[PDB]
């Protein structure tokens, strides 16, 4: 996250760190959606142009974290992967369309003050909240500039109009993406960056005061560049796939 701030303790208790076993490194962000399912970006797990193809056994999920590098004894929980599910129409070849993947954990994680699942949007919360100018929140341990943070970073960013998103890039944008961030004329800045991938873009519903995950950090051109925007997987659009996976494999 660039131009963000340190998270408060327990501010994002659905934040998940994807952690590679060897070498022990941050892989990606992710989010807790129930006691056994974690949501992330598909490119975090499968991106052949970069020779990326991780299997269950290659990673761990660390939940309840704050500090990036520290082992947060008595607070974080570390979970092993039972199975990865990538969207069958994820388009790694061109534009990262349908950039979404699910991970089932071997065992349920225990909720606590620091570990708690986020909601997934219903069609109505989505229509209400996904509006140009409405702000969401992005969190992660990624780069601070286009070094690395000591603790989880947060930034609030406004959703951008679809014509503005398209005109800012040469990438073919799809209905399964949205972009967010300030315009150069708006005097505020901030963006996700490498390492923030897979983490959640959340909004707090004003109707029921619950946090919903509207997006997944997916891609961008550099980080926090003037006239560029961050792009996010549109969670509500891929919900059918999400439910089908959880309904089919518990």
């Amino acid at each position: 996250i660039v131009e963000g701030s340190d998270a408060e303790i327990g501010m994002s208790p659905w934040q998940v760190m994807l952690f590679r076993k060897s070498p022990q490194e941050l892989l990606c962000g992710a989010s807790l959606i129930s006691d056994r399912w974690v949501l992330t970006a598909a490119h975090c797990l499968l991106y052949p142009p970069w020779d990326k193809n991780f299997t269950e056994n290659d990673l761990l999920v660390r939940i309840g974290k704050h500090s990036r590098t520290r082992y947060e004894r008595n607070i974080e929980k570390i979970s092993m992967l039972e199975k990865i599910y990538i969207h069958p129409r994820y388009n790694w070849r061109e534009n990262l369309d349908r950039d979404i993947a699910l991970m089932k954990l071997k065992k349920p994680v225990a909720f606590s003050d620091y570990i708690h699942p986020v909601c997934l949007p219903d069609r109505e919360t989505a229509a209400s909240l996904l509006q140009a100018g409405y702000k969401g929140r992005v969190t992660g341990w990624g780069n601070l500039k286009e070094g690395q943070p000591s603790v989880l970073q947060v930034v609030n960013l406004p959703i951008v109009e679809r014509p503005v998103c398209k005109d800012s890039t040469r990438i073919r944008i799809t209905d399964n993406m949205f972009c967010a961030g300030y315009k150069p004329d708006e005097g505020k800045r901030g963006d996700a960056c490498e390492g923030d991938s897979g983490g959640p873009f959340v909004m707090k519903s004003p109707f029921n005061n619950r946090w919903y995950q509207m997006g997944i950090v997916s891609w961008g051109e550099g980080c926090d560049r003037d006239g560029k925007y961050g792009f996010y997987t549109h969670v509500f659009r891929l919900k059918k796939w999400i439910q089908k996976v959880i309904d089919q494999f518990g």
């Binding site: 941050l26 590098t69 082992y71």
Partner: peptide, 10 residues
């Protein structure tokens, strides 16, 4: 490189 060691169990 600068990640504290996680318990061997994991």
């Amino acid at each position: 490189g600068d990640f504290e060691e996680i318990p061997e169990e994991y």
